[PDB]
Amino acid sequence: SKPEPSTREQFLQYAYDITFDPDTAHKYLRLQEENRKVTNTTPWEHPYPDLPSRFLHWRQVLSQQSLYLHRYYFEVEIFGAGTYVGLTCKGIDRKGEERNSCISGNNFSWSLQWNGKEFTAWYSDMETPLKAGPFRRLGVYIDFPGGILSFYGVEYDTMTLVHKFACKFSEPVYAAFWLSKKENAIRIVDLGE
Ligand SMILES: [Cl-]
Fold first, then answer.
1. What's the gap in Å between 57 CA and the centre of ligand 1?
2. Do β-strands 37-40 and 29-32 pair in parallel, antiparallel, or remain unpaired?
3. Can you give the residue range of the structural domain that contains 38?
4. 148 CA to middle of ligand 1, Å?
5. Which superkingdom?
6. Which residues does 142 contact at the CB level (< 8 Å), separation at least 6?
7. What total of structural domains would you count in the chain?
8. Cα 12 to middle of ligand 1, angstroms
9. What whole-number distance in Å separates Cα of residue 52 and Cα of residue 61?
10. What spacing in Å lies between the alpha carbon of 73 and ligand 1's midpoint?
11. 84, 117, 81, 114: which is closest to 102 by C-alpha?
């Protein structure tokens, strides 16, 4: 196993293309920019086909890509109180009304919330208030073999650690996004250039 990354340049060696999966998106979420932008447009709903994959209650969407057995890095730009960014497993219950169907409410999902005043780390209904931020751009690092999920505030070439989770990774994971409030928006940064 390599040295852990330190500089933005080192994280960018693990740059991985993420896109939102329209088959998962809650109807109150609009996808744009070739599935690299998601907005909560409540009360404007979008005519997605009914699918078993689609979230019913929670305003969530997953990545098309799964992450399994390597190191990965992607950046997102986030806007609005009530956004969560994290990881989950395919088995997350898409139709569930309970918090076990949201990415802050079960033992196989890990997430970072911006609540309007602070960042908060979530795992299985347990919350950890955090000091760092706010930051409009986050870097999300997944070391699948090393059982690490870490979030950084990115400003120019500076990276400020927001939180580092220790994760017991077994299954493939998906990036997971929850836009709980009207006008919440998340863009996947094109790290291509
Ligand atoms: Cl919601």
1. 6
2. antiparallel
3. 1-193
4. 26
5. Eukaryota
6. 67, 71, 72, 73, 87, 148, 149, 173
7. 1
8. 32
9. 13
10. 26
11. 84
